[PDB]
Design a protein around this nucleic acid. Structure first.
Ligand code: MG
Ligand code: MG
Ligand code: MG
Ligand code: MG
Ligand code: MG
Ligand code: MG
Ligand code: MG
Ligand code: MG
Ligand code: MG
Ligand code: MG
Ligand code: MG
Ligand code: MG
Ligand code: MG
Ligand code: MG
Ligand code: MG
Length: 74
RNA sequence: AAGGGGACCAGCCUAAACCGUCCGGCUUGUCCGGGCGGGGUCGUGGGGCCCUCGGACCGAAUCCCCAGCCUAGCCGAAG
């Protein structure tokens, strides 16, 4: 049962990682405790749409820095 | 059971793709979901989306009117 970790978890994986666990662990532990959500298609693109923003909104923190590394060093 | 002979005869709407809008959520958006509207309905497969071209007949099982019919009756030959 693939689920999306919402927290860095011991020997399981990092936050945002999609790992496989037994169903009982998912519905009776990981899911009612907020530690993860199930890897449905519905909130699978939710994950792709956040890695997207961060990928863009981080490289923008890089593109603007250069727009001054070129100015000031000159 | 197929097949043959007959009775009757009639075919339709939708889900999904893709658009639009509204509302919700807080994993902030090219986000997810819920509505509603548009789209669409097929087996030679069909539909969606993008290119070129071509630009009125059909018609309900729904509604209206009417005939007809039903719920009383009536005329009716000649000792
Ligand atoms: Mg047979
Ligand atoms: Mg027959
Ligand atoms: Mg919608
Ligand atoms: Mg619809
Ligand atoms: Mg429609
Ligand atoms: Mg249609
Ligand atoms: Mg239609
Ligand atoms: Mg329709
Ligand atoms: Mg048809
Ligand atoms: Mg065939
Ligand atoms: Mg096709
Ligand atoms: Mg008919
Ligand atoms: Mg009909
Ligand atoms: Mg009489
Ligand atoms: Mg008499």
């Amino acid at each position: 049962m693939k689920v999306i970790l919402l927290e860095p978890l011991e020997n399981l994986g990092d936050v945002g990682q999609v790992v496989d666990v037994k169903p009982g662990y998912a519905r009776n532990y990981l899911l009612p405790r907020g530690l993860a959500v199930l890897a449905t298609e519905s909130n699978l693109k939710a994950l792709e749409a956040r890695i997207r923003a961060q990928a863009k909104r981080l490289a923008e923190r890089k593109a603007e820095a250069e727009r001054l590394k070129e100015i000031l060093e000159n």
